[PDB]
């Protein structure tokens, strides 16, 4: 963690770099009922969705965690 005492711009920049919505949306997926809500009850087409599901799958179910 890098801190600058008495500045709010550095906190916003660090929170944008660590938790970038585009990359974090690329490394995950939207829930199914949320996808149904935006595609049908909001009129958003499928091609205007953010990119999801680019995390590579592990070998097993056991290989997905360190606990």
């Amino acid at each position: 963690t890098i801190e600058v005492l008495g500045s709010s711009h550095v906190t916003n920049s660090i929170n944008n770099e660590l938790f970038d919505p585009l990359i974090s949306q690329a490394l995950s997926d939207i829930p199914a009922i949320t996808q149904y809500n935006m595609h049908v009850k909001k009129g958003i087409p499928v091609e205007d969705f953010p990119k999801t599901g680019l995390f590579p799958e592990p070998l097993n179910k056991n290989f997905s965690s360190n606990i």
């Binding site: 890098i2 801190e3 600058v4 005492l5 008495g6 500045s7 709010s8 550095v10 906190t11």
Partner: protein, 436 residues
């Protein structure tokens, strides 16, 4: 802080000098070498004045004669906040950095920038937190009661403070510190309420604290170069920082110095075993000393008229004459029996070892016979033999047992030379069978 077991130079707390730069016979763990200590005090005043830059000082002498200990005394007498980079000679032969780049990074880690800034903090003990939330969480109303030993207050809380308080969960009786601008809340622990443990703060709640930062030039060079972030200061893969960013940093530091926003502090770069460097490193050092942003370089070597690395000729101290022309040489001497006895006494008091007087005389005799470091090493293994037979003070026969068990160099060379058929020679010829 600064965890450490016991070092080989842990008994040295600094140079033993008075106000007139004269060495005491025994002070701050240093015994003997009065001329070397006086010269190192002059170099210390050279560093502390800070009005000149780029001077080379060579410390040369026989092995195991106070060479690294002088540098440790200088570094201990320098104090905090002044940089001190201590590298070895063979450390600059990298695989992803050139030798001149590694030398430049070692040079620019010894110049610091002093910046003073003031912040506002709120530190106190939490009395009561009252949070009112809606069903959907669209709005939240908050009241926080916080106190010190001298005042009590209640704050009306905003949305972002409420979200920053439910994160990093705080309860009653905690002692916390809040920065208003950045929103960072640090839990310092719990107060003295049994119902880790930290005494309640006193005085005003909102204090104005000024902190003084010391940032090396290499950190600004890494940060200003946009190819890698600040994490390269820890991972170490900076990877050949260019020169235009260094020029920009130099011009900006010179611009900050005129307006009083920053101060230049110089440090000491210590290069132990300087004879291991290559000729190209010497040629880079010949021009790196002629810059305004250059520290004071201390080099140590024990070679006498050795072959310069990367060449085919022999040079004094293993260094070419161009580097020796730019340097002033401090020479160390060998020790008498009284200096060896005093050093062994200090090393005995450092390791919490009780020595008898006859054992000290035997250790001094076998120190002036073979080496100082052998007799220094014998004490800690003689103490285990003393403790094995359930005795506290180290006696004569314990030192004799340690002399019998662990060999020195001169006995091992003779034992090798009498039985040369049992060891592998330079031709790879050995004999393993006993008979024939």
């Amino acid at each position: 802080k600064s965890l450490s077991l016991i070092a080989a130079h842990s008994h040295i707390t600094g140079l033993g000098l008075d106000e007139n730069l004269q060495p005491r016979p025994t002070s701050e763990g240093m015994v003997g070498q009065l001329q070397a200590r006086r010269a190192a005090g002059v170099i210390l005043k050279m560093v502390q004045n800070g009005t000149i830059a780029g001077r080379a000082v060579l410390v040369a002498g026989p092995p195991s004669t106070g060479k690294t200990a002088l540098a440790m005394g200088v570094s201990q007498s320098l104090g905090k906040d002044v940089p001190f980079t201590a590298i070895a000679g063979s450390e600059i032969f990298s695989l992803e950095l050139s030798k001149t780049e590694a030398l430049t990074q070692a040079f620019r880690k010894s110049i610091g920038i002093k910046i003073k800034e003031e912040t506002e903090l709120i530190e106190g003990e939490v009395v009561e937190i009252q949070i009112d939330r809606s069903i959907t969480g669209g709005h939240k109303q908050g009241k926080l009661t916080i106190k010190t030993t001298d005042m009590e207050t209640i704050y009306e809380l905003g949305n972002k403070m409420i979200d920053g308080l439910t994160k990093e969960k705080v309860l009653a009786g905690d002692v916390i510190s809040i920065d208003k601008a950045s929103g960072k809340i640090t839990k310092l622990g719990r107060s003295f309420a049994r119902s880790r443990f930290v005494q309640c703060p006193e005085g005003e709640l909102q204090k104005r604290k000024t902190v003084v930062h010391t940032v090396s030039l290499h950190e600004i060079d890494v940060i200003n170069s946009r190819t890698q972030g600040f994490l390269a200061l820890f991972t170490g893969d900076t990877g050949e920082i260019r020169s235009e960013v260094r020029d920009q940093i130099n011009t900006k530091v010179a611009e900050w110095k005129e307006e009083g926003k920053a101060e230049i502090v110089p440090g000491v770069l210590f290069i132990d075993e300087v004879h291991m460097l290559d000729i190209e490193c010497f040629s880079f050092i010949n021009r790196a000393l002629e810059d305004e942003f250059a520290p004071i370089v201390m080099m140590a070597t024990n070679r006498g008229v050795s072959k310069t690395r990367g060449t085919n000729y022999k040079s004094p101290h293993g260094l070419p004459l161009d580097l020796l022309d730019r340097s002033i040489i401090i020479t160390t001497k060998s020790y008498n029996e009284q200096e060896i006895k005093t050093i062994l006494s200090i090393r005995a008091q450092e390791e919490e070892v009780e020595l008898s007087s006859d054992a000290l005389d035997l250790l001094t005799k076998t120190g002036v016979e073979t080496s100082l470091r052998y007799s220094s090493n014998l004490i800690s293994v003689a103490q285990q033999i003393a403790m094995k037979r359930k005795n506290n003070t180290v006696e004569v026969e314990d030192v004799k047992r340690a002399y019998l068990l662990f060999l020195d160099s001169a006995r091992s060379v003779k034992y090798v030379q009498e039985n040369e058929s049992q060891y592998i020679d330079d031709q790879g010829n050995v004999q393993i069978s006993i008979a024939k």
